[PDB]
């Protein structure tokens, strides 16, 4: 008679590679790189993802003629910008800190919009109704931005203003602003009468002072003169100062931030969809409980380390010999 | 192979065998077949399962990782940006790959360590009541019947 | 007769971890991972650590009235902040390039403080002994910065001032001055006569002008007019020159800087004490030869290396099998 | 056990063992005892102490690292910062306890195949003048005082 | 009869370590550090490098009168800076954004100088002759750089200046031009008349105006006054304007840039020669396939991994037991 | 080491053998010589060529890397570059030197172990045609030629 010790062998095909030999086939095996995704942006949280669609955050939060869609938004799990969000400051200018307002959004999951300085009720001794331009178009006609209003001369005479705001929304509010600068005196004259107007704007912490800076620069949008963006976190309790002679374009509509953990902003081209996951991706979703992805270094909730390798197998059986 | 046991001494493996990783043939009077060893199989399947959890662990799970945009005068500080995006894109590549290749390679040396061992227990608990063939297995002398070949499976056996 | 070979077996009750297996008793084995430390702030290098307390760093250099405690302090192991370290800037305004000036202490172990502009002889043409505030109180009365000189109007004439200071420490100076704004015009002009005044400062490689940006901005402190302040390194043998026709708050003290890398500034609740250390962290000292520690990531001195662990065991014995 | 021998064939260990870390029993008619191979133990003890000074030579030292402070308007440096920070940390949190993971794995087989060892030198000098009973013990056919013990030991057993 | 197995053993003195032995003799090992350099600066993609000598990238850009043999080179693998690299801005200022334009060089592997606006005919109206200073000698005489314009006041006049250029190159134009600053508005005067002069400049994406700071500044290279210097990057298409009415520092050369990436500036004193290489570090080139190499951090082209191990050597034979 | 053989019960190499790492020496009545392993050497030197080539295979070849420079209020961003540059420089640092003590480790165990297996491999073959005189020397019985001695390296021995 005769026992004879042995080790098991199956049809498997599955290899992985050691340090001293490659492509040796074995009988079990566990993959560690997910590489699959549904194309799809979808909903974190249960909450649907902001659409910037063919604007950005600039058109976004400073209200582009054009973005009229995001309106009504007022919470998100992720921003996503496509590959055609242009519309932005449409009114040629400088977005100043643009990036860092970039940034702070990242980690807002949601906010309330309000209208601090009412546009009928706030400017008495100013024209709160001429402040469009075809620079920013609406139905062909000459428009402006949905949350700044542009503020010129009321009869030849454009006095000193002084406007605060209080924030009582126990939160930080986001104050957006334009400072406005003419091609021509002649031009700086007829919106504002007078020649050698200056914005001040201040807060417990913020403090600055603008100066008109004439001059005709190459035309953008079709204009030489430009206005510059402006933006301050106005913190729960503090107040916000603006007192002008001219070239204010003013504060329409601000935004209580609610702050959110974990969020950000991201691109892509991929659709909008009915779905729900914890990892998102620029290309798609990941549903997996692998430790590695090799789909996107992007991530946005619980997802796999991300990382270039091609394959991630490890043996969990032996060296595969059927001999058959 | 590291122990010379797999792909060595015992050449290819069983196909036939299906209840384990490490097993016996046997062939009785009474008939042949095939039968795995418990205790071996099992334990490999816990420590390998430990490893791959243990792998697991280790790696850390990636939460909300999104990009900053910079302006036309921020090259420096974008490009010391990016230089730190790649810079631990790198190592984790190379931690992750150079564990499981390490790995890869000690897992097969244990198996081929477990049957190894397998083999030398059944050879120290025959010894002189059969003979060393060789492909690991044993000629019997005192035709070895079923109960007689589980004896030896179960380790009990003890026959001087 | 028996000769059996065997293997060390003890009471140890050690346990490390493998890959293959979890919990494993051992004979032997050590404890890399250091995780205790005396909860004390001590001396490095026979050297104190400069304790600000209730004050920052900002309070400190421009000697706000509340740090005097810190006057006579000069060298330091490092420097401590505490989370009351709130006394700094008393009267409202923008402390230019702030962190930087804070990066630039961390490698400063010591320093010479110099009346750079004596008081009583640098200004015979301007009011030298109006220059305080209630946004400055000491003892309940006005007062201000020990380190700098609010200078006012003269019998209502505020003449161009000129000084000058030639560094001959044979080290970096660091210069600190303020440069303030009245909210009125009618201030501007009780305080400084000169409606239109400037101020100008330049050296080797410095040089920048000062307008006055009148405009009452929200009362912080009492205070509706703001105060900026600035700094700058005079480099050994170098020049540094304040022109000005109103609203310069000169220096008065400044301080001849010792480099010393190896320091730093650490923000610390946890008390100074009479004792020594090679290891110095947030929470506490630490001394111990083991490479690892999970005390803190923030130190100062020779430190085992900072880790996220938990527990880093390593084995030197086998296997504990007693088998009792 | 990779090796077969520490809870293996030699299913425990000794705690009347108190020499070293592998060593003999012995029951001779002169009286028994424990003794430990100074010659395999030192090596041992040398090769582990080499191992731990090896570990700690690679894992630097840290001296002087504090923070930075960062204004209103520098969110994005501020979380560059961060991220370097972070990113460190867990790469050296990942090296030192995955170090300690695989030298311990090594560090139980390398005792493991020093016990074997043992036991195949003690074997192959003692031949056929004694058997294999098994828990790694020798049975001696010819009378072995403790003269004859010690020389087992020092591998100076040198008799036909 | 016998037969014996047993392993290869020579007289090789090669040592490795390992976790539990440290020098160990080996058959056979290989080395994987690469120590060794040419300590020379040798030519990558088969074009030599720029070697600034005497003159950094300011001297070079704005074109210092010591930096003349640099005038004909328009083409470079690399730049060469040394550690006697002082010829920049001869007379004192501020230049802008400096270190940002010696990153966009980085990239930048030859550009196409043009006199953009030509000294004999673009100021009609302007005195384009007198623009030379004591600070920016040539020849013991006074002169000026060679790619900028100094223009002062014609026969006491000074009218309002527009010059603009269209970037028609079809890359981007990289445009650099200063802003003087007078100590005195005496000086003001004799050069520009106009006591209230600006400098305006825009492109579609440029927009800033400059404003004389008259003030005594501490004497540099024997100036008071102060000349501050700007750049930008004129993209394909835009257009630049500059507008003045005193103390611009106009651009005579620009630069119209190549990029072919992957290089940079270096610091060496080592010497330039006719010699060519793949991996070039301050130190010199590198002729290696070695995986690692601790000859410098900075590198140039492709090059093995540096690292700060002294030793680095595998073992591929067996221990060297030659038991002679 | 760890198998026993190499700088083991096999002493020490031979510096007579030059055409392979492991090999036989065999005394026969017509003469001696040495003789290599082909089927070991050569796969020992596939596995090693392998293990290097993968080694140099993990580590990424460096591009250009050039100094950034900044002005005198930028020290923060300046240090933070350097504690970039750093942070990496001594991760890299340490993978390299830490890769190639681990598998210099592992390679000399490698060849330990194949030694060993030759040696059981020699064994299994003569069974009692010879008896294990050690220095993994086996003495024959039944005399052998070169002929028969060539028939035990290219393992077509037989004969029980
Ligand atoms: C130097 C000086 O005049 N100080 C006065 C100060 C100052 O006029 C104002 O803060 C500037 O706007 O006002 C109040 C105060 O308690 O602060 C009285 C001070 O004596
Ligand atoms: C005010 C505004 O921004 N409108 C323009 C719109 O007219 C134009 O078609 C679009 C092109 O993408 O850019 C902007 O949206
Ligand atoms: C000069 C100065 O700063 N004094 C204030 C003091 O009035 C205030 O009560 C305290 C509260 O933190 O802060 C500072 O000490
Ligand atoms: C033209 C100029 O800049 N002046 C001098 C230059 O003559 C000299 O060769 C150089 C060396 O330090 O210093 C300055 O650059």
């Known amino acids: 008679d005769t026992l004879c010790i042995g080790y098991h062998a199956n049809n498997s095909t599955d290899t992985v590679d050691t340090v001293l030999e490659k492509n040796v086939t074995v009988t079990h095996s566990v993959n560690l790189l997910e590489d699959s995704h549904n194309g799809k942006l979808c909903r974190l949280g249960g909450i649907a993802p902001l659409q910037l669609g063919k604007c950005n955050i600039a058109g976004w939060l400073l209200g582009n003629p054009e973005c009229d869609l995001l309106l009504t938004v007022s919470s998100w799990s992720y921003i996503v910008e496509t590959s055609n969000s242009d519309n932005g400051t449409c009114y040629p200018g400088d977005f100043i800190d643009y990036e860092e307002l970039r940034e702070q959004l990242s980690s807002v999951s949601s906010f309330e919009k309000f209208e601090i300085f009412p546009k009928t009720s706030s400017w008495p001794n100013h024209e709160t109704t001429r402040g469009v331009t075809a620079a920013c178009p609406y139905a062909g006609a000459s428009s402006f931005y949905r949350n700044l209003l542009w503020l010129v001369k009321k009869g030849n005479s454009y006095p000193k203003l002084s406007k605060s705001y209080v924030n009582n929304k126990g939160k930080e509010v986001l104050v957006l602003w334009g400072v406005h600068h003419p091609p021509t005196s002649t031009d700086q004259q007829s919106l504002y009468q007078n020649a050698d107007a200056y914005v001040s704007v201040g807060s417990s912490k913020y403090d600055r002072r603008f100066t008109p800076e004439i001059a005709a620069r190459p035309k953008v949008r079709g204009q030489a003169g430009r206005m510059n963006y402006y933006w301050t976190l106005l913190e729960p309790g503090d107040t916000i100062t603006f007192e002008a002679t001219g070239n204010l374009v003013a504060p329409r509509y601000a935004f209580a931030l609610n702050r959110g953990s974990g969020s950000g902003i991201i691109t892509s081209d991929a659709p909008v969809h009915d779905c729900d996951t914890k990892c998102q991706t620029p290309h798609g979703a990941i549903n997996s409980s692998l430790p590695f992805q090799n789909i996107h270094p992007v991530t946005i909730g619980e997802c796999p380390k991300y990382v270039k390798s091609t394959k991630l197998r490890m043996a969990t059986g032996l060296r595969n010999i059927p001999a058959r | ?160």
Chains 1, 3, 5 share one sequence.
């Open chain 2, 1 to 160: 192979g590291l122990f010379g046991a797999i792909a060595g001494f015992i050449e290819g493996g069983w196909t036939g065998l299906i209840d384990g990783w490490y097993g016996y043939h046997h062939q009785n009077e009474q008939g042949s077949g095939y039968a795995a060893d418990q205790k071996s199989t099992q334990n490999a399947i816990d420590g390998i399962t430990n490893k791959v959890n243990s792998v697991i662990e280790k790696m850390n799970t990636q939460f909300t990782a999104v990009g900053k945009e910079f302006n036309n005068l921020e090259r420096r500080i974008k490009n010391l940006n990016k230089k730190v995006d790649d810079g631990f894109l790198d190592v984790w590549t190379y931690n992750a790959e150079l564990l499981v290749l390490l790995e890869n390679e000690r897992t097969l040396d244990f198996h081929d360590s477990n049957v190894k061992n397998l083999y030398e227990k059944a050879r120290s608990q025959l010894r002189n009541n059969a003979k060393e063939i060789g492909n690991g297995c044993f000629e019997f002398y005192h035709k070895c019947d079923d109960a007689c070949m589980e004896s030896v499976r179960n380790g009990t056996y003890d026959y001087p």
